[PDB]
């Protein structure tokens, strides 16, 4: 024939291991609007749930981070390196600039596009402390 | 692989079948060497590390410790005599959970208080439910 010999039940083709429609596009808007811009000053109207607010656990039983201010924005704001150094020196961690630059380099290797927030620095500071204490428990006994 | 009788010594289980693999075993007529309910592939060290503390429970605990005059005197006297003593921070061989940081030996910071929660529990925000050591084992394995 001029065409092929497809019997039109062969149009059912899509099997796993082919085409792989994993990361194409997901049409529609999510319930938690985590893709569009976040309001620094939310409207009196405009109930949209921009990724702010919280769950009922975080509102009924809030952490005292959330009490008297400081919400999750202040922990994942990109922040300046000298600002983070000043914050942690005021807290009293007391590291020299060599160790601070090493920790900053590790934190910016973990986090993409630079950034390094105070929560990321706290997490890598927890990793380093846990590594040091695990090495002490490794080379020493069980006191 | 290994049955639970040789590896499971606590209440917690990091690889729980969740009510559905048991029907696979019973419908496929699996003997208790391939059954999920009886046999797992977790390992004995992972059951020990399935706790969420990185500290060690003191076996039998001092029961009162705050309500007795002896409790108050042992609070008051050795308050300034215990800061020199160290903590028992699990085992570095046993923990296959901390990230690999290369230097780790010449970089020191002085003033820090050890958080009770595991740093992998605390850093569950960067891996995108409430994080539990079951999620931790299912993520840092397989």
């Amino acid at each position: 024939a001029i065409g092929g010999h497809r019997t039109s039940a062969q149009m059912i083709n899509a099997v796993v291991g082919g085409v792989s429609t994993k990361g194409y596009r997901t049409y529609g808007v999510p319930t938690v609007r985590s893709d569009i811009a976040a309001p620094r000053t939310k409207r009196i109207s405009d109930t949209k749930n921009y990724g702010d607010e919280s769950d009922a656990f975080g509102l009924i039983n809030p952490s005292m981070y959330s009490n008297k201010g400081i919400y999750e924005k202040d922990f994942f704001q990109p922040r300046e390196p000298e600002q983070i150094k000043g914050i942690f020196s005021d807290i009293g961690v007391e590291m020299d600039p060599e160790t601070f630059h090493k920790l900053w380099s590790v934190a910016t290797s973990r986090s993409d596009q630079g950034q390094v927030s105070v929560e990321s620095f706290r997490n890598v500071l927890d990793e380093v402390q846990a590594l040091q204490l695990a090495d002490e428990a490794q080379n020493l006994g069980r006191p | 692989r290994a049955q639970l009788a040789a590896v499971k010594e606590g209440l917690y289980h990091p690889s729980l079948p969740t009510f559905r693999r048991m029907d696979m075993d019973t419908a496929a007529h699996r003997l208790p060497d391939e059954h999920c309910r009886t046999t797992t592939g977790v390992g004995p060290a992972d059951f020990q590390n399935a706790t969420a503390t990185y500290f060690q429970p003191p076996a039998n605990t001092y029961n009162g410790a705050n309500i007795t005059d002896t409790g108050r005197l042992l609070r008051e006297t050795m308050k300034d005599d215990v800061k020199s003593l160290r903590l028992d921070w699990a085992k570095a061989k046993d923990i296959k959970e901390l990230p690999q940081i290369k230097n780790t030996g010449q970089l020191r910071f002085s003033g820090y208080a050890v958080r009770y929660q595991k740093p992998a529990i605390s850093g569950s925000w960067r891996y995108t439910q409430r994080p539990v050591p079951a999620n931790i084992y299912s993520r840092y394995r397989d």
Binding site: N61, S63, M64, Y65 | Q117, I121, S124, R130, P131
Partner: peptide, 15 residues
């Protein structure tokens, strides 16, 4: 996951 405020024990009658 982040830690909550302490349980204040209400010390009513001290010594």
């Amino acid at each position: 996951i982040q830690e909550r405020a302490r349980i204040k024990p209400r010390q009513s009658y001290p010594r």
